[PDB]
């Protein structure tokens, strides 16, 4: 559907990552 899913009724009873600091990829490639 891609519309936001309503709550269920009831109640209980190259850097590695662009966003954060996780370092860098090793130099190389899977197919040079």
């Amino acid at each position: 559907e891609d519309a936001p899913r309503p709550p269920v009724p009831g109640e209980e009873g190259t850097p590695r990552r662009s966003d954060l600091d996780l370092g860098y990829e090793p130099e190389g490639s899977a197919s040079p």
Partner: protein, 320 residues
Amino acid sequence: DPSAKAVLTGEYKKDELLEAARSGNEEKLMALLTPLNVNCHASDGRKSTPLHLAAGYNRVRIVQLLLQHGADVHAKDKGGLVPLHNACSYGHYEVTELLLKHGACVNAMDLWQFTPLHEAASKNRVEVCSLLLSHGADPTLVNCHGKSAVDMAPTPELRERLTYEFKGHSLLQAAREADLAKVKKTLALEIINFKQPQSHETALHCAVASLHPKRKQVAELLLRKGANVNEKNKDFMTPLHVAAERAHNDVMEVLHKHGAKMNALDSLGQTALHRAALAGHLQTCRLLLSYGSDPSIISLQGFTAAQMGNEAVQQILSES
């Protein structure tokens, strides 16, 4: 207008039936419940049926009464939830059991492809997850976001539990159906006969070679848990060959007990007896003969056990 007034009045009773279901008011419920509204839907929001609300709010007696009086266990709300979704989302074990008893579909998918197990796993309903698994819930099914119940489980312990219990129930169900291929598939990753990638040794080879004091108990445990007693390594040595060559006589007896083949030949055409003889292990040789090792077997190099052994070995062997 008569038709419109009837619609308004019905809508009122309906709203109040829903409220009685939600709050667990049995008297009110039984006063309002008729064949015309047992499967009604709320006007607003998810448009839940009374069963959805009784399930979500842990109203066990209301759930019993609704089901007894014609409530549809498969009724979908506006988002495609069935009441099992509601019960599972909030960890209501008794309700969940009751809905399953009345035929609820354990892997029912709503419009986002969430199952009841997605709900129970995501909200850490540990006991309900176990219950769902025992009824065939599958925690590898992905929703529309590409997430399984395993992906949604908030703890490593619950993730481990989902996988373990799913495999376990899959094995039980396959056994119930005598489904030989599924039994084999569920057992594919048992580690008891894991092989060292190079030498092709198993835990039993390692155990019988061990110097440590508990080797006998360890080998016995491995065999009880399903170790192949005659597994050959890269050099075609069985655990008997390994134990015999080091005179580990305690473990040899357990091997014999478990059906170890006495006359298995290694890559050199040698029995365990050849190896015991060659090493000069007297008691090992006597034990092996008593188990029914054949002393006449000629190795690839042209030798009987006797031809490889010292004087004392030779004497043991000509008695047989």
